[PDB]
Amino acid sequence: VDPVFSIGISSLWDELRHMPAGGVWWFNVDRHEDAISLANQTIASQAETAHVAVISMDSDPAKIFQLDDSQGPEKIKLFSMLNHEKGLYYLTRDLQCSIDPHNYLFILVCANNAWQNIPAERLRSWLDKMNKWSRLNHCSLLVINPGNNNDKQFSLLLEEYR
Amino acid sequence: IIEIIVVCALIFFPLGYLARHSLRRIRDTLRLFFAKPRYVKPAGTLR
Amino acid sequence: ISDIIEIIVVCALIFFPLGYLARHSLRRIRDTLRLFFAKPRYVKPAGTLR
16 A cells, blocks of 8 residues: 655666665765765655655755656655764654654764764664664655765664564 | 542553553554664655 | 532543553553463474474
8 A cells, every 4th residue: 555665766676675664774985075966866756655754964954955847745854963973863752742643754864974973783773773663654764875985884873684 | 449449440450551542553553753864864745 | 519510520531541551561461471381282292203
């Protein structure tokens, strides 16, 4: 019943492209401009009835996130958070106070090296809470992290494959 | 007297049971109403 | 009349947390009941095949 969302990559097989509602998918990019372009393409590639929203850091999302005039949803919600760990920690409660997450998509475009100050154990706990919240609310979450030294973070993400 | 008190107790016991069963709903509604975003401030849904 | 209303309010007040704790600790109560005797039906242990 819950619709599946699509990633913004042209000529990509649906096996690596389709995303069911109620899970978490992680994306890392070499450059922040690549993150912005991917986020804009994902926004433009979603369905009209899809509920998609974007959360950014250290900027005003109203001036850096756009939609295609010919394709994409009619409207999306723009959210701004402080460049701090507490913002990421409270994200769930803030969005619950703001948006009903059922059949609704998260796109978290973080700043450059934003996930460098997060400790390993707290990151694991946060990921577990996000996954449980996604399953409970049947909501899908996408995180785009522009970073260069996330090899240890990549290994940690691999270890939490469940 | 005692009979009416027992009736009220019988009323309120499943009532509280159902209220607890909707704990998540109550919490969600209260968070919607009070609306305390401590760190994530919605800038605005853009067109 | 007034005392009747007071007593009704008192009973409601005492019995609301009664069911609140009944639902809150329901899982623990079921676990303790399972522990005591319950009814281990259907699946039955055959034996320790060493």
